[PDB]
């Protein structure tokens, strides 16, 4: 039975997660084991660098956080939770944390390198994705949220910026900074304005249904080339979200608009993914009728777009950033705060 298979898989996956969650892996590498190639990304968190593991010649993306800045920006819990979740999860569409360690000044997350770059760049370059192209990425998100939500995990930051394309043209969810273990409800104001569910904006207690609303935003942005709610300032974006009046481009198929009306649903008792049949309301929708869910999960489906492969450490799909020094203090900074990292 196909439904008996999913239940057994999820039961084993929960058991694997709880074990790693209870006793997280720590200090599984050292900085001297790597060679820096190029800064791939920057921000308040710190930076992401393409690195080369000296012994193997293998390439990885290394996220480096400055402990002092993390403490100053009050992101200690956010940083610890990001790493604790990432080392405990295992799914084909989730970025793998290969190693983690810390020194006197920094925290290091060595992640699987995704040379295809961000979906964001590909989407802005092409303008908009066709419906079968958008469908292929959407299907991977559906299976990822089904996995995360079974572990009582809410993602909270779905957007093309947090999705990256691998060598096979398959996607990977990246940033686990806003991911949270939620048994019942949560109230924290977090996520990206364009992707926020009305209940977050309205300061209500919320759950995993916020991720299904964000899926509706993602699908709309992939298909149209722009989000369903946009404006110059976040405040003006929020007013559009709470209004809920969605306009669809004329090129959107009827099956697409229908699915979108059910995901971009203000009423929590009517939003797909949040009803009696849970994820199956989405999986069995007409828009996903040509989707072979097992073939997507098993990565057997031919991707609609395969990025230009030019070596394992190729950086052509990333923007250039100022190459800043990696300073390591002689003095141990914030030792107590990052004890569990």
């Amino acid at each position: 039975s196909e439904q008996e298979s999913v239940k057994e898989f999820l039961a084993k996956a929960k058991e694997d997660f709880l074990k790693k969650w209870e006793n997280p892996a720590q200090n599984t590498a050292h900085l001297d084991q790597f060679e820096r190639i190029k800064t791939l990304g920057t921000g308040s968190y710190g930076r992401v660098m393409l690195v080369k593991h000296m012994e193997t010649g293998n390439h990885y993306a290394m996220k480096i956080l400055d402990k002092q800045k993390v403490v100053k920006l009050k992101q200690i819990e956010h940083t610890l939770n990001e790493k604790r979740i990432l080392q405990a999860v295992n799914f084909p569409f989730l970025v793998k944390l290969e190693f983690s360690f810390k020194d006197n000044s920094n925290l290091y997350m060595v992640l699987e390198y995704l040379p295809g770059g961000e979906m964001f760049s590909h989407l802005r370059r092409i303008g908009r994705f066709s419906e079968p192209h958008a469908r292929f990425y959407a299907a991977q998100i559906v299976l990822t949220f089904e996995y995360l939500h079974s572990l009582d995990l809410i993602y909270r930051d779905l957007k093309p910026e947090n999705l990256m394309i691998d060598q096979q043209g398959y996607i990977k969810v990246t940033d686990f900074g806003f991911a949270k273990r939620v048994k019942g409800r949560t109230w924290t104001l977090c996520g990206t304005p364009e992707y926020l569910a009305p209940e977050i904006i309205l300061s209500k207690g919320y759950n995993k249904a916020v991720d299904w609303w964000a899926l509706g935003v993602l699908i709309y942005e992939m298909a149209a080339g722009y989000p369903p709610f946009f404006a110059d300032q976040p405040i003006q974006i929020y007013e559009k979200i709470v209004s809920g009046k969605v306009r669809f481009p004329s090129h959107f198929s009827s099956d697409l608009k229908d699915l979108l009306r059910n995901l971009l649903q203000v009423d929590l008792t009517k939003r797909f993914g949040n009803l009696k049949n849970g994820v199956n309301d989405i999986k069995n929708h007409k828009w996903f009728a040509t989707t072979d869910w097992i073939a997507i999960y098993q990565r057997k489906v031919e991707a609609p777009f395969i990025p230009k492969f030019k070596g394992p450490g190729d950086t052509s799909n990333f923007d250039d950033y100022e190459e800043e020094e990696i300073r390591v203090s002689i003095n141990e900074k914030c030792g107590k705060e990052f004890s569990e990292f």
Partner: peptide, 18 residues
């Protein structure tokens, strides 16, 4: 058009979390 409104706006780049 809707795309034109978006393109001319200040939110076409990578968006930060709040």
């Amino acid at each position: 058009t809707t795309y034109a409104d978006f393109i001319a706006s200040g939110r076409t780049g990578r968006r930060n979390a709040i």
